[PDB]
Write a protein that binds this ligand. Structure first.
Ligand SMILES: O=C(O)c1cc(C(=O)O)c2c(n1)C(=O)C(=O)c1cc(C(=O)O)[nH]c1-2
Ligand SMILES: OC[C@H]1O[C@H](O[C@H]2O[C@H](CO)[C@@H](O)[C@H](O)[C@H]2O)[C@H](O)[C@@H](O)[C@@H]1O
Ligand SMILES: OC[C@H]1O[C@H](O[C@H]2O[C@H](CO)[C@@H](O)[C@H](O)[C@H]2O)[C@H](O)[C@@H](O)[C@@H]1O
Ligand SMILES: [Ca+2]
Length: 338
């Protein structure tokens, strides 16, 4: 049996989309309606507000700190907005966070006009081992765009700290890294092998975990789940007729849980659970375990804290689920002797 203690790190957030650990029990969090909050042991502080398209699954979403933070004080956000004609689109922005009087300054757009909708806006952003910013996007309710290399929809993007496609991107002067995605909301890198992983929502069933290769085509909408065809990279997990609704995902690392080292943690929305996936040598699926089924309701993000503790966000305030007192929250999971 797995043994642990869970505390509430913060509460009554509105759809806390993304958590970025600062160390010393401080955290930056986005709330989907358009705000970036600092969480401290002390209390809750509003860093920045944003006028976002706060409708359906759109709003203020991913959050990433520059790999050199706080020395290079750059903070990246992924945000929905109403474009010309009232259509929902998505952008990636960046500001300098003042390490004192925590305030955000010189916010500029890096990437504009990503397609968007009430559904399928992607949204997860994270720096990988190569120092590049990766960005997930959904098919914006328009599945064919996922196969279209002239479109930013249904992709995983990879750009530098400035939003530029690196010369070694797979496609000519293009931010695209991989394609054929429906609605990916989770990415991480295995801390030893550097293998990249991503989650995805499937059409009802067929939620996925994928190993992300440079220039890979993940099949949507020509294929869903394990299709067994040469032209599409298949998922390593395919939930079949079951629905997880996975978003955020992180590989476990650090001192806290040595026996979970290199397992993949996945927050599930409708699944209302934390999935844990054990990868063998050469990234074969050894085991999948399932935690907290229906105790907290909908879960959205999962990240490892500076000490190796597991941070989770709840998402019952999107009202696709029912509320617990003081939802939504950030929960921290530590080992028993802590
Ligand atoms: O089949 C389902 O029941 C189901 C549930 C959910 C959910 O729990 O919100 C999503 C999806 N599907 C889905 O396809 C999807 O792209 C999605 C995005 C989100 C989100 O909250 O950002 N939820 C869901
Ligand atoms: O994204 C690729 C292309 O998609 C559209 O074309 C497809 O859909 C049409 C129906 O709306 C058909 O007429 C067409 O034959 C399909 O290939 C779009 O019209 C194209 O411009 C895109 O390149
Ligand atoms: O045979 C159907 C599968 O084809 C591809 O997988 C093969 O090709 C890859 C590189 O060409 C190999 O790495 C892989 O191990 C082979 O199985 C495709 O990527 C799979 O999704 C298909 O199911
Ligand atoms: Ca797929």
């Amino acid at each position: 049996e797995w043994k642990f203690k869970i505390s509430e790190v913060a509460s009554d957030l509105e759809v806390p989309w993304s958590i970025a650990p600062l160390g010393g029990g401080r955290y930056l969090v986005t709330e989907r309606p358009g705000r970036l909050v600092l969480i401290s042991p002390s209390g809750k502080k509003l860093v920045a507000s944003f006028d976002v398209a706060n409708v359906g699954e759109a709003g203020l979403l991913g959050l990433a700190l520059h790999p050199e933070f706080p020395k290079k004080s750059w903070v990246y956000l992924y945000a929905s907005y109403f474009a010309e004609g009232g259509h929902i689109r998505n952008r990636v922005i960046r500001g300098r966070l003042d390490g004192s009087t925590f305030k955000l300054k010189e916010v500029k757009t890096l990437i504009d006009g990503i397609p968007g909708a009430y559904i399928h806006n992607g949204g997860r952003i994270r720096f990988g081992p190569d120092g590049m910013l990766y960005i997930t996007t959904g098919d914006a309710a328009d599945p064919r765009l996922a196969q279209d290399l002239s479109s930013l929809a249904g992709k995983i993007l990879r750009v530098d700290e400035e939003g530029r496609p690196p010369a070694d991107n797979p496609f000519p002067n293009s931010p695209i890294w991989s394609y054929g995605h429906r609605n990916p909301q989770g990415i991480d890198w295995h801390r030893a092998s550097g293998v990249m992983v991503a989650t995805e929502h499937g059409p009802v069933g067929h939620d996925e975990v994928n190993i992300i290769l440079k220039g890979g085509n993940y099949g949507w909408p020509l294929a869903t789940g394990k299709a067994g065809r040469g032209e599409f990279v298949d998922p390593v997990i395919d939930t079949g007729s079951e629905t997880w609704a996975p978003s955020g995902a992180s590989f476990v690392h650090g001192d806290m849980f040595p026996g979970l080292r290199g397992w993949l943690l996945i927050a599930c929305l409708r699944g209302s659970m934390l999935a844990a996936v054990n990868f063998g040598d050469n990234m074969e699926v050894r085991k999948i375990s399932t935690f907290f089924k229906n105790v907290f309701g909908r879960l959205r993000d999962v990240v490892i804290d500076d000490d190796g503790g597991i941070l989770i966000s709840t998402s019952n305030r999107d009202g696709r689920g029912s509320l617990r007192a003081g939802d939504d929250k950030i929960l921290k999971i530590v080992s028993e002797q802590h």
